[PDB]
């Protein structure tokens with residue numbers, strides 16, 4: 001009966017990304033040090049998790065969006081979201 | 091029908107914080123290397139997520155507490171919890 | 181009505197671990213840079229969260245598995261999963 005969130009952060013400013021699953025859709029709010037704003041992530045899902053890592057100064061984000069028993073991985077690597085290779089079996 | 095948790099950690103000892111949403115309330119358990127104990131975080135919420143980052147040796151924690159469609163951000167920056175600026179729109 | 185996931189990552193390749201709670205059981209999918217595969221974690225739980233940290237190059241993972249109001253901590257420290265000391269009270 002409530003939305004479900006997932007959060008990641010990087011750097012020292014820092015950058016924060018908060019993903020919210022709400023009525024089957026996942027959206028993204030962003031902080032880069034001076035105000036929250038809406039990010040470019042908008043994908044179907046009833047459940048979300050997230051992890052991220054740096055390579056040097058370059059951020060890489062992985063968002064795991066689940067509907068039913070199907071989890072779709074979404075990838076940010078500095079220049080657009082792409083579908084990742086994650087599968088739950090095989 | 092089960093509680094919902096979120097976890098973060100920092101350092102090498104390490105420090106761990108585990109947040110549990112239970113019957114609309116979020117509480118905090120803490121590990122600083124030698125035993126679990128109850129933390130000072132106690133706020134309403136049906137869902138919780140968390141992220142944290144270091145600036146030097148200084149930890150900063152952000153806990154996202156959601157009830158219905160409203161997410162409240164709680165901030166630890168070394169000396170007490172404060173409400174953060176996060177909003178889901180505007 | 182959907183599975184619930186939790187994700188962690190470490191290093192630069194990176195390593196990713198994704199935990200899925202599905203019908204009361206938590207399983208693990210792994211990425212070490214070249215293909216997803218099934219990990220050795222398989223434990224009861226309706227809800228999962230995870231955190232991890234490095235000591236030097238050595239990864240340490242903590243998975244928090246909850247059923248009802250009982251959260252069990254599972255520990256990876258390079259050579260097998262063990263039950264952790266976490267308790268929600270006392």
Ligand SMILES: OC[C@@]1(O)OC[C@@H](O)[C@@H](O)[C@@H]1O
Pocket residue numbers: 017028030032038039040041076
């Ligand atoms: O500056 C915001 C942004 O570009 O940051 C990286 C990702 O979080 C994107 O979805 C997002 O739109």
Ligand SMILES: OC[C@@]1(O)OC[C@@H](O)[C@@H](O)[C@@H]1O
Pocket residue numbers: 062073075083084085086196211
């Ligand atoms: O470059 C994207 C990718 O290779 O990154 C590592 C993992 O997240 C993979 O599933 C994903 O396809």
Ligand SMILES: OC[C@@]1(O)OC[C@@H](O)[C@@H](O)[C@@H]1O
Pocket residue numbers: 107118120122128129130131166
């Ligand atoms: O030592 C425990 C503590 O001070 O650590 C930082 C935050 O997790 C606080 O809520 C918590 O009470």
Ligand SMILES: OC[C@@]1(O)OC[C@@H](O)[C@@H](O)[C@@H]1O
Pocket residue numbers: 016031152163165173174175176
């Ligand atoms: O100092 C607190 C604060 O500015 O930290 C960064 C973000 O978490 C903000 O929403 C929050 O208000």
Ligand SMILES: OC[C@@]1(O)OC[C@@H](O)[C@@H](O)[C@@H]1O
Pocket residue numbers: 197208210212218219220221256
């Ligand atoms: O290489 C996979 C593996 O050994 O990595 C560390 C842990 O995630 C284990 O459960 C997992 O089987």
Ligand SMILES: OC[C@@]1(O)OC[C@@H](O)[C@@H](O)[C@@H]1O
Pocket residue numbers: 106121242253255263264265266
């Ligand atoms: O070595 C395992 C252990 O001591 O690691 C730190 C915490 O996760 C504890 O609950 C856990 O028992």
